[PDB]
Write a protein that binds this ligand. Sequence first.
Ligand SMILES: [Mg+2]
Ligand SMILES: [Mg+2]
Ligand SMILES: [Mg+2]
Ligand SMILES: [Mg+2]
Ligand SMILES: [Mg+2]
Ligand SMILES: [Mg+2]
Ligand SMILES: [Mg+2]
Ligand SMILES: [Mg+2]
Ligand SMILES: [Zn+2]
Lengths: 214, 140, 72, 102, 64
Amino acid sequence: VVDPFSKKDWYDVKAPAMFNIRNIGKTLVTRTQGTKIASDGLKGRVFEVSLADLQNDEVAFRKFKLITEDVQGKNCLTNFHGMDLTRDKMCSMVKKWQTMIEAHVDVKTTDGYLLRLFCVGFTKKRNNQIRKTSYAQHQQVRQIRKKMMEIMTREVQTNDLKEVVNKLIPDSIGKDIEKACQSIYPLHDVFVRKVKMLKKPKFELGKLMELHGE
Amino acid sequence: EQVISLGPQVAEGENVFGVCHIFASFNDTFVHVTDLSGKETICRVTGGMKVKADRDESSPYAAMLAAQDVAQRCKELGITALHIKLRATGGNRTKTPGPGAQSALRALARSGMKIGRIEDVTPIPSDSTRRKGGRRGRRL
Amino acid sequence: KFNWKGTIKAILKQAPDNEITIKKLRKKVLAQYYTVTDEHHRSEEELLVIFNKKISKNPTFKLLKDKVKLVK
Amino acid sequence: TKKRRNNGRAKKGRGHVQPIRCTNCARCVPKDKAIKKFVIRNIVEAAAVRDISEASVFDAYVLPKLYVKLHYCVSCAIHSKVVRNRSREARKDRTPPPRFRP
Amino acid sequence: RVQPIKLARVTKVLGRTGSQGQCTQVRVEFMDDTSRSIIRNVKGPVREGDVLTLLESEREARRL
RNA sequence: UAUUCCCCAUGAACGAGGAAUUCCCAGUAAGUGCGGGUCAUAAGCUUGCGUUGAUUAAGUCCCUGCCCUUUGUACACACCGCC
RNA sequence: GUGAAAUUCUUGGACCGGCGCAAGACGGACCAGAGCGAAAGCAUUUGCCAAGAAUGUUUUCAUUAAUCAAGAACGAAAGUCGGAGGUUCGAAGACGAUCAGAUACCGUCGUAGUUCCGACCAUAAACGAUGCCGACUGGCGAUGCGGCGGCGUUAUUCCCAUGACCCGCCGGGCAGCUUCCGGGAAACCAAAGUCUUUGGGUUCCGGGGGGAGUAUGGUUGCAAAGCUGAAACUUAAAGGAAUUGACGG
Ligand SMILES: [Mg+2]
Ligand SMILES: [Mg+2]
Ligand SMILES: [Mg+2]
Ligand SMILES: [Mg+2]
Ligand SMILES: [Mg+2]
Ligand SMILES: [Mg+2]
Ligand SMILES: [Mg+2]
Ligand SMILES: [Mg+2]
Ligand SMILES: [Zn+2]
C-alpha cells in the first residue's frame, strides 16, 4: 500500500585513492528487515564512472567500472572492475582507407587479478602523402600486433592493480605502443580499448583498506 | 520538498545524479530513470502510459508527457541531475533511435533538470544472429 | 448473376429490324446491370470492356460499323 | 540490352561477395551492389541544442555524435529517394553530389 | 498543470505547407525571452510582424 | 385534350433536404425586377440591362486534369491496351 | 506488432534497468569497381601442414609444346542417407488481419531445414549472358604484387641498412577514362579490331517459331532426378537493337 521510497536510505559511493575525486555519488537501498540485509544487497553494484568525473583534468572518453566491495556505514567502498572507451570515441576513430590493428592478451598481475586487455591502433597518413589509402601489409600488421601484446604483457605482468590503474589513467601503455611501432608502420590512434576482469582472489579486507587509505 | 525522509540529506549547492535510460524505439518510448549503479529504479514512464490510441505511443508528444511526469517524480525524490543513456532497438534490428528521443530529452532539460553526460548504449553486434524478413524482405 | 447475352438478345428483339445503335444498346444494358446486380466491386471500365467483349465476340450478333444486328 | 557496364555493382576481380541485409526491409543485397550511406548526425538535434546547453551541469561540454552506416536495397533507395533515375550520360557520372557548403 | 499561455511574435514566413497549401511556417519569437525562437504551423493569413498565442508552447515544427 | 388573362371558392405536399454533386473570388456570388428573341395569342427558357450588394482567398498540387523534362514498356484500334 | 489493428505476453508481476550463468550460431564498422583461387568460392587471434602465381636470375634440361572425342578430379543453394546438435531464422502447418474472395502479400507462432561429421546428387541468370593458346594495332591517370633508380621528409640511433611517404622506369595482374584505330543491325566494343583486301592453331556448338528438352529406348542415382534424345502434327512470323507517340498506382 505504502510507497516503497519511505523504506530506503541513501549511501555514499567512494572511489579508491588512485583518483583524487573520491566521492562518486549517492546510491540507495531498502533498509534491512526480515532476512535480507542492506549490505549484501548493496554489494556487487557496478558504477560506470567517466574518468573526467574522477580526475579533474583528464579525458572524458575513458570510463571506469568500480564495483563495490564493502560497506563502512554510510559509505560504499569500491575497487577497480574494468575500463572502457565511450561509444562515440570508438566509432569516431574507425574510418575508411586505413588499416585497423587490434590485439588482446590474457595476463595476471602479481596479486592475482587476471585481466584481459584489448588494444587498438590505426595506420597513419603522412603529411606529404598523396595516395588515398594507408594500408599495412599482412606481415606489418602481424608484427605490430606482436609488439602490442608484448608491451601490454610486460607492463601489467610485473605490477599489481594500483600502478596498473595508474598506468591506465593517462594511458601510457598506448603511448608506448605507438612509440614502439613507428619503425614498422606509423600508427596514430593507439589506445587500450577495454580492460576486463576475469578473476579476483578471496577479498582481503586489509587490501581494500590500503586502496582506500594511504 | 522536503519530505524529509524521501530524498538524500545533501547540501544546497551540489547536486545528486541519476541515470536516465531512454529507450526510444519505433512503436514506443521509455523514460526509465535509475540510480548511478542502475540497479535501483526511481521512476519509469513510457509513452503508452500517456496515450490511449495505440498508434502514437511513439509520437513525440507522448514522449514529452512521459518525460515531464518522470521529471516531476524524480524531482520530488530529490534527484536533480541526470546522465543520459540513449538507446535504439539495435542488435539485429535498426540502429536509428525512434521519433521520441527528441522530445523526451528536450522535455527533461526544459522541466528543470540538470543534464550530465550523454551517451549511446544501443546494442551493436559483431555480425550475429540472422534477421527476420526472409530473403526478399518484407514486401509491403 | 446478370445475364449479358440474354439481355442483349432481349433488347435486340424489341428493336426495329432487330437493329440498334451501339450507344443505345450500351445505355440500356448498363442500366439493366445496375438495376439487377448484387456484386459491387466491378468498376466502370471493367463493365465497359465486358460489354465490348459481349457484343463484338458473339456469333449471334454482327457489327454494321456503328451498330449491332441480330443474325437470324 | 545491357544497361550498365558494371552490372550495377562493384564486382570486378572475384566470384562471390557476401550478402548483407537492407536496413529498412531486410532484403539480402550483395555488399558491392548495396547503396551504402554513412550518417554522422548529432544526438542532440541542433534545433534543440540551446536548451540542453543551458541545462548542462558542465561549462564546456561538446555533444556526442551518432554514427550509423546504412545499407539500402535498390528498391528502398529509390522509394526513400536516396537515389533517382538519371539519363544515359547522366547515369555514367560517378561524382558524389556536391556538399552544399554555403 | 499545463505551461501557461505564451505570446509569440512572428519573424519571417517560411512558406506554405499542409498538402493543400493551407498552413504556413512562421519562426515565431517569444517576446519574453526574445532570444528563444521556434518554428510553428499557423492556419489563416499570417502577415509576419504580428502576435500569436500558444496554448501548448514547446511542440515543434518539422522543417520544410 | 382546359391558348392566355380576370373574379369568387377549393387549400395538397413541403418544417431547410440521404449517398452524391454544380457554379463562383469584386461591383463578383446571391437577391431583385426590366427589355429583346420566339410572338395572331404568349415566358417557369434563353440572350442582354440596371438595381441592392457580401462571406472567404492572394494559396497548393492532395483529388480531377493540363503543359514541359528525365525514365520504363511485351501498348501503336495506343491502359477502355496487351495478356 | 501494424497503414490501422488483432492473434500473443502480462499484478502468478510482463516490458524496462542491474548482476551473473549457459547454449548454439555469426564474424559488423575497417571492407575498396582491393586481393587470392580452375571454377564453385574465400574475412576474429595464434600455431602447424603441404601448395601457388608474379618477380629476379650471364642456373639447368633442350622442343619436352597448344587444343583436345573416350576417360577423370572438383562443383553455390536447395534436396537425400546415417550420426551429433538444435541459438536464430524459417518451406509445410495453425491462427490474426486485409479483401468481393485471399489456400497470398502484412502480423503472431511454428515442423523439415538452416550448424558440424561421414556418404550421395551434378544442377544455377554456375554470366563478362563473350572457348583456350599465340601475334599485331592509340593515348592517359591511377591501383595491387615484385624488381630497379632517384631531391628530400620521418622512425630507431649518431652512421649504413631497414620500414612510412615523395618522383619515375620495367614486368605480370583487377579495372577506369578518352579516342573518326577499326568493327558492328545498333546498343556498344581497344576488343566484339587486324573479314568479299574473306586462310595463325584448335575444341565445343546454332540453322524460322512451336510440339519439346516431351514420347521412347539406353544409361547413372536410394530417391528427387541427371545425361543422351525424336516424330506425327501445327504455324507466317516469333525475335534483336534503336526511333516517334501513348500510357505508367
Ligand atoms: Mg503499445
Ligand atoms: Mg512497392
Ligand atoms: Mg528493360
Ligand atoms: Mg557466381
Ligand atoms: Mg551443396
Ligand atoms: Mg519466430
Ligand atoms: Mg544442407
Ligand atoms: Mg528450329
Ligand atoms: Zn530494402
